[PDB]
Ligand binder design. Structure first.
Ligand SMILES: [C][C][C][C][C][C][C][C]C(=O)O[C]([C]OC(=O)[C][C][C][C][C][C][C])[C]OP([O])(=O)O[C][C]N([C])([C])[C]
Lengths: 101, 140, 49, 50, 77, 95
């Protein structure tokens, strides 16, 4: 899983000037991303994947997988957390999140 | 074919050929209001199609194959090749996905101590995987 | 159908309505029975009529 | 008599400083987030795809 | 204060038992995000809103605002 | 100087103010008033009801029935009546 942010410093809009700019993507003037990545191990062979939809995309996205057996299992995106810590450094880390997984 | 869906059994109201009678590989729906479709025939030939009313503002398209990602521009009711990202002789693209449009609820993820990271939201992105033998690597 | 965040819009198929009505009825009857006792006893004893 | 006013001001300000200022007051940047714009990236383009 | 401590704890206990993991209403005024932390204990989402509240919020208001009702129904000190 | 008859008319004022902060708010919730318009609406109508109380029941002489009337009709029991309004407004908005 890779997650894309405009800038990793905790409070910054390095770009994405939103007032009147009227971006032009075909020139190539757009802002470029920064990213954070993690890897996880799963027991069973995943044949295919999708992400669920709702009327307003508020609830967690629930990555849904079809395995080789034909069994179908989903996991919420909250479990696949980039920027995670090993749960030793999550204790009394005020900076982390609300309910940091 | 054009089919009228009714509460009762439907009726097949029209059948007709395309302009060019070749085998059809895939169809992409273009802008809703203009009622356009881009049809990719096997032999890899693209046909712009404007069926009926249903009774610069560039348009950009993106096609992918096992050989690479191609991209096209639709201007003046014609299709034009714009760029190419083709893999080597021993590489083969395996997975590809587009950015689904999503309703925007919150503009940034907020931290404890109430600072916000301003997640990256640029709509015209695609992701893909290249599987390479002769190094045994997977590139994203 | 799946519910990733739990089902919070529709309340439940296992809501305990009877226990809630029992609690309300117990409070109602205990008030209605304890009111005469407190009223008569304290109001007529505090003024010593 | 202004000593009473100043002392009651201190008793009004201790509550603000000590208990309401833990996390329940704006002037943080994480509180004006729901009143910010999107910047309207493309504005002339469609980008259909597979 | 036993008069303060007994019934409010009992009511919080009862409310958290019977009414959990629900969205009850939306308040008409926008709170700040720490109130989203306090009020939405039932739900495990991350961007729902600050204005949408669980059932416990209805108690958090009903404690403060019940004085006029107690006065009107008839009660005295 | 003054007697213990202020408690009675003070209680009458308190009953009037209490009964005029749970129909306001409920009306606001019936009309689906939004966040800040609701508070401005409440302030305007509440002070209007206080003024018509000074005119009608009190006979244009706030003194001779309360001492320091500008303190007692308007500023006293004000944060005990914004909250009842908030309760009734939340109850009305949810229906
Ligand atoms: C506990 C009683 C409930 C009080 C909640 C405040 C309600 C008034 C209110 O909505 O003002 C909000 C509260 O935005 C905030 O959340 C910041 C709070 C500012 C007041 C801090 C007092 C020290 C700030 O004013 P605004 O113009 O920047 O917001 C946009 C306009 N609006 C949609 C609100 C019409």
């Amino acid at each position: 899983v890779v997650e894309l942010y405009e800038s990793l410093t905790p409070d910054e809009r390095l770009s994405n000037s939103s007032d009147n700019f009227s971006y032009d993507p075909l020139t190539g003037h757009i802002n470029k991303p920064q990213f954070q990545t993690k890897q996880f191990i799963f027991p069973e062979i995943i044949k295919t994947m999708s992400i669920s939809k709702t009327t307003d995309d508020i609830t967690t996205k629930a990555i849904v997988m079809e395995l080789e057996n034909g069994q179908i299992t989903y996991i919420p995106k909250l479990l696949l957390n980039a920027r995670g810590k090993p749960a030793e450094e999550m204790a009394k880390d005020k900076k982390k999140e609300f309910m940091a997984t | 074919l054009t089919i009228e869906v009714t509460k009762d059994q439907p009726i097949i109201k029209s059948r007709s050929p395309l302009s060019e009678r070749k085998t059809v590989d895939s169809v992409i729906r273009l802008n809703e209001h203009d009622h356009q479709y881009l049809i990719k025939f096997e032999d890899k030939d693209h046909l712009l199609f404007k069926l009926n009313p249903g009774k610069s503002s560039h348009i950009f398209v993106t096609e992918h194959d096992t050989n690479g990602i191609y991209g096209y521009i639709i201007e003046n009711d014609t299709v034009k090749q714009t760029w190419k990202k083709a893999v080597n002789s021993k590489e083969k693209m395996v997975a590809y996905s587009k950015r689904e449009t999503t309703n925007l609820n919150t503009l940034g993820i907020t931290l404890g101590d109430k600072s916000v990271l301003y997640k990256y939201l640029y709509p015209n992105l695609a992701a893909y995987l290249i599987a390479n033998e002769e190094h045994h690597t997977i590139t994203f | 159908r799946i519910t990733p965040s739990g089902q919070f819009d529709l309340m439940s198929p296992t809501f305990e309505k009877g226990k809630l009505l029992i609690t309300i009825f117990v409070l109602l009857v205990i008030t209605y029975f304890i009111r005469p006792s407190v009223s008569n006893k304290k109001l007529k004893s505090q003024w010593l009529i | 008599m202004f000593m009473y006013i100043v002392f009651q001001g201190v008793l009004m300000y201790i509550g603000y400083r000590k208990l309401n200022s833990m996390g329940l007051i704006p002037n943080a940047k994480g509180d004006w987030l729901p009143w910010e714009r999107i910047a309207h990236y493309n504005n002339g383009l469609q980008w259909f795809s597979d | 204060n036993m008069a303060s401590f007994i019934p409010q704890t009992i009511i919080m206990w009862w409310v958290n038992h019977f009414f959990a993991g629900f969205i009850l209403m939306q308040l008409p005024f926008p709170l700040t995000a720490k109130f989203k932390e306090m009020l939405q204990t039932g739900i495990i989402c991350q961007d729902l809103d600050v204005r949408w509240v669980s059932s416990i919020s209805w108690y958090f208001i009903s404690v403060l605002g019940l004085n006029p009702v107690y006065n009107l129904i008839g009660l005295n000190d | 100087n003054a007697t213990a008859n202020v408690v009675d008319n003070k209680k009458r004022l308190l009953f009037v103010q209490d009964s005029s902060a749970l129909v306001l708010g409920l009306v606001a919730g019936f009309l689906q008033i939004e966040s800040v318009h609701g508070f401005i609406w409440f302030l305007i109508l509440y002070n209007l009801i206080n003024v018509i109380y000074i005119v009608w029941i009190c006979q244009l002489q706030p003194g001779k029935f309360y001492q320091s009337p500008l303190h007692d009709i308007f500023f006293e029991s004000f944060f005990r009546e914004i909250t009842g309004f908030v309760m009734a407004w939340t109850f009305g908005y949810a229906l």
